[PDB]
Amino acid sequence: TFVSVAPGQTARITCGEESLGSRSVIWYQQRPGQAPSLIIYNNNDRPSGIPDRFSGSPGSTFGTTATLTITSVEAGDEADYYCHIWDSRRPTNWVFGEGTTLIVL
Amino acid sequence: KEYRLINCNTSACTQACPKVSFEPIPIHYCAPAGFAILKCKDKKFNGTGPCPS
Amino acid sequence: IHLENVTEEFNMWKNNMVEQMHTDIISLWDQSLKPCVKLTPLCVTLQCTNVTNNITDDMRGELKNCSFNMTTELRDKKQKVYSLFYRLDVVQINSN
Amino acid sequence: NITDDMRGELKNCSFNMTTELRDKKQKVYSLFYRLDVVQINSN
Numbered sequence: 001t002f003v004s005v006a007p008g009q010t011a012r013i014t015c016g017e018e019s020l021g022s023r024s025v026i027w028y029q030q031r032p033g034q035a036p037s038l039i040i041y042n043n044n045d046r047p048s049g050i051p052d053r054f055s056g057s058p059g060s061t062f063g064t065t066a067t068l069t070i071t072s073v074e075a076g077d078e079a080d081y082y083c084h085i086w087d088s089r090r091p092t093n094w095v096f097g098e099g100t101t102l103i104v105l
Numbered sequence: 106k107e108y109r110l111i112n113c114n115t116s117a118c119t120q121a122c123p124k125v126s127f128e129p130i131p132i133h134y135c136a137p138a139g140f141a142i143l144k145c146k147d148k149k150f151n152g153t154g155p156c157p158s
Numbered sequence: 159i160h161l162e163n164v165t166e167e168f169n170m171w172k173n174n175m176v177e178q179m180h181t182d183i184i185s186l187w188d189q190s191l192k193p194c195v196k197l198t199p200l201c202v203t204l205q206c207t208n209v210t211n212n213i214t215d216d217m218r219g220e221l222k223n224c225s226f227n228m229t230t231e232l233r234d235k236k237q238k239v240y241s242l243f244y245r246l247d248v249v250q251i252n253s254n
Numbered sequence: 255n256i257t258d259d260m261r262g263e264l265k266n267c268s269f270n271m272t273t274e275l276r277d278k279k280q281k282v283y284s285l286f287y288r289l290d291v292v293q294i295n296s297n
């Protein structure tokens with residue numbers, strides 16, 4: 001899962017199983033050696049501290065993959081990304097999704 | 106090399122009774138009472154317009 | 159046509175032609191089924207599981223996902239096909 | 255009590271029959287007369 005995009009361009013990171021019903025995704029990021037950190041807590045909502053351009057796929061779509069849309073990337077966004085889907089048909093995910101890594105030029 | 110009938114996916118085919126035949130017999134269509142049937146006896150009649158006989 | 163100076167005694171309960179409406183609708187309802195399909199090969203052994211859903215043990219899933227043997231268009235070959243039903247149409251016959 | 259000179263007028267026949275379910279079939283028996291059944295051609 002290695003995605004590279006020369007900096008200042010756009011970026012689309014997919015993660016997790018395809019959607020079945022209504023979903024509530026959570027995106028986390030992980031710098032190397034650090035603790036994790038929240039970036040997205042809803043389908044398209046972010047808390048304070050993390051800026052914009054980190055868009056999310058809305059959960060109202062049926063039968064799609066959760067994506068993470070980043071524009072104007074940098075060396076700070078170079079991290080390991082993680083998804084946590086909360087489907088209204090699938091059960092509770094006590095483990096996270098698959099580690100999708102971002103690396104920049 | 107296995108085949109099938111061509112009508113296997115649209116309908117079950119009613120087999121015709123071999124007792125009954127398909128030869129044509131002359132049917133005469135008769136009008137009920139109160140109605141009449143007019144036949145045009147003109148030779149050069151192309152089937153449209155006024156017939157004289 | 160609106161009448162004048164006239165009065166009749168009516169009774170909706172011993173009235174006729176409501177019985178005729180009932181019989182006509184029942185027989186006409188029966189007459190719209192003779193061209194349609196009888197489900198003779200369908201009353202069959204149904205292998206049903208729960209619907210794929212976040213199952214709550216206190217409540218019940220109102221959908222059961224049932225796979226079964228069904229005859230194809232050919233009499234020799236038969237297929238395995240699945241569908242979805244409600245609780246109110248299936249019952250458990252008496253593990254598996 | 256069978257008499258070899260005469261004949262019993264009842265034959266007790268068991269057979270395969272389809273149930274209400276198309277997959278399962280059952281073994282069920284009944285009684286008939288000689289005048290309704292014939293031998294097809296030991297067993």
Ligand SMILES: *[C@@H]1O[C@H](CO)[C@@H](O[C@@H]2O[C@H](CO)[C@@H](O[C@@H]3O[C@H](CO[C@H]4O[C@H](CO[C@H]5O[C@H](CO)[C@@H](O)[C@H](O)[C@@H]5O)[C@@H](O)[C@H](O[C@H]5O[C@H](CO)[C@@H](O)[C@H](O)[C@@H]5O)[C@@H]4O)[C@@H](O)[C@H](O[C@H]4O[C@H](CO)[C@@H](O)[C@H](O)[C@@H]4O[C@H]4O[C@H](CO)[C@@H](O)[C@H](O)[C@@H]4O[C@H]4O[C@H](CO)[C@@H](O)[C@H](O)[C@@H]4O)[C@@H]3O)[C@H](O)[C@H]2NC(C)=O)[C@H](O)[C@H]1NC(C)=O
Pocket residue numbers: 022042043044045057058059060
């Ligand atoms: C018979 O009657 C019964 C009842 O009498 C009817 O039953 C009702 O049926 C309707 C529809 O079936 C249900 O509506 C859903 O409601 C839920 C809950 O909505 C509430 O909460 C929302 C979020 O809460 C946040 O905001 C509020 C402030 O509003 C805040 O207090 C709270 O703490 C929290 O922070 C509110 O947004 C929402 O307000 C909305 O409605 C108001 C009504 O008038 C309106 O004034 C507001 O302006 C606002 O529009 C309400 O308070 C909703 O979640 C749900 O909508 C989501 O789900 C459907 C299906 O999946 C989807 O199509 C929608 O698009 C929507 O999904 C978006 O929102 C998610 C929220 O995070 C997001 O995660 C999704 O990804 C998706 O997000 C996308 O769009 C949004 C913009 O919408 C965008 O921001 C994102 O970036 C992304 O692009 C439905 O609205 C009722 O709950 C239900 N029951 C009752 C009691 O009413 C029944 O329908 C009747 N039947 C008939 C035949 O008449």
Ligand SMILES: *[C@@H]1O[C@H](CO)[C@@H](O[C@@H]2O[C@H](CO)[C@@H](O[C@@H]3O[C@H](CO)[C@@H](O)[C@H](O[C@H]4O[C@H](CO)[C@@H](O)[C@H](O)[C@@H]4O)[C@@H]3O)[C@H](O)[C@H]2NC(C)=O)[C@H](O)[C@H]1NC(C)=O
Pocket residue numbers: 086087088090091092212213214215
């Ligand atoms: C998929 O469905 C499952 C149900 O099988 C559901 O799991 C439940 O999640 C909730 C929260 O996510 C768990 O916690 C409950 O939360 C409510 C809200 O406050 C409390 O009131 C509950 O307390 C009651 O139940 C306790 C026993 O569980 C009692 O100790 C207590 O006194 C109250 O009576 C409770 O804390 C809930 O426990 C689970 N269910 C089970 C059986 O564990 C899950 O959330 C669903 N997933 C999705 C994505 O929808």
Ligand SMILES: *[C@@H]1O[C@H](CO)[C@@H](O[C@@H]2O[C@H](CO)[C@@H](O[C@@H]3O[C@H](CO)[C@@H](O)[C@H](O[C@H]4O[C@H](CO)[C@@H](O)[C@H](O)[C@@H]4O)[C@@H]3O)[C@H](O)[C@H]2NC(C)=O)[C@H](O)[C@H]1NC(C)=O
Pocket residue numbers: 255256257258
């Ligand atoms: C169940 O059915 C059997 C028949 O298979 C029956 O057995 C018969 O019982 C009788 C008496 O109980 C036997 O004896 C006969 O009795 C009569 C009456 O007197 C005689 O006339 C008979 O003589 C004739 O047959 C003889 C050969 O059996 C000849 O030698 C003689 O010249 C006569 O022709 C005869 O003695 C009878 O033999 C048996 N049958 C056989 C085949 O052995 C039995 O009683 C029945 N049981 C019940 C509870 O009903």
Ligand SMILES: *[C@@H]1O[C@H](CO)[C@@H](O[C@@H]2O[C@H](CO)[C@@H](O)[C@H](O)[C@H]2NC(C)=O)[C@H](O)[C@H]1NC(C)=O
Pocket residue numbers: 208209210223224225240242
């Ligand atoms: C009902 O059960 C059937 C199985 O009989 C499911 O069909 C399978 O679904 C899985 C999940 O996508 C697939 O990997 C299989 O290939 C499917 N098999 C067939 C034959 O289709 C079906 O998804 C279930 N449906 C519901 C609504 O639960």
Ligand SMILES: *[C@@H]1O[C@H](CO)[C@@H](O[C@@H]2O[C@H](CO)[C@@H](O)[C@H](O)[C@H]2NC(C)=O)[C@H](O)[C@H]1NC(C)=O
Pocket residue numbers: 207208213214215216217218219
């Ligand atoms: C699948 O369906 C069966 C019923 O055929 C479920 O078994 C019981 O379901 C009720 C309510 O749905 C629960 O209260 C019982 O506790 C269940 N029995 C047992 C032994 O757990 C079953 O839970 C459903 N789900 C699975 C995964 O089998």
Ligand SMILES: *[C@@H]1O[C@H](CO)[C@@H](O[C@@H]2O[C@H](CO)[C@@H](O)[C@H](O)[C@H]2NC(C)=O)[C@H](O)[C@H]1NC(C)=O
Pocket residue numbers: 205225226227238
């Ligand atoms: C559909 O038909 C197949 C074939 O008869 C059934 O599979 C058999 O199931 C029995 C009981 O579980 C087994 O003893 C046999 O070994 C199976 N045979 C084969 C060829 O699989 C099956 O149960 C039927 N129903 C479904 C839902 O698949």
Ligand SMILES: *[C@@H]1O[C@H](CO)[C@@H](O[C@@H]2O[C@H](CO)[C@@H](O)[C@H](O)[C@H]2NC(C)=O)[C@H](O)[C@H]1NC(C)=O
Pocket residue numbers: 256257258259260261262
């Ligand atoms: C059972 O029925 C068979 C007939 O299918 C009997 O066989 C013959 O029956 C006649 C009259 O009933 C007798 O005259 C013959 O002698 C019988 N044949 C033999 C070889 O004995 C048969 O007797 C009946 N009873 C039993 C116990 O098999």
Ligand SMILES: *[C@@H]1O[C@H](CO)[C@@H](O[C@@H]2O[C@H](CO)[C@@H](O)[C@H](O)[C@H]2NC(C)=O)[C@H](O)[C@H]1NC(C)=O
Pocket residue numbers: 268269270281
């Ligand atoms: C009812 O069905 C069973 C099952 O087919 C029949 O039993 C078979 O009989 C043949 C011929 O005697 C044997 O070769 C098989 O081994 C039998 N199979 C089983 C499972 O028993 C039976 O003949 C049918 N009829 C009756 C009256 O039982």
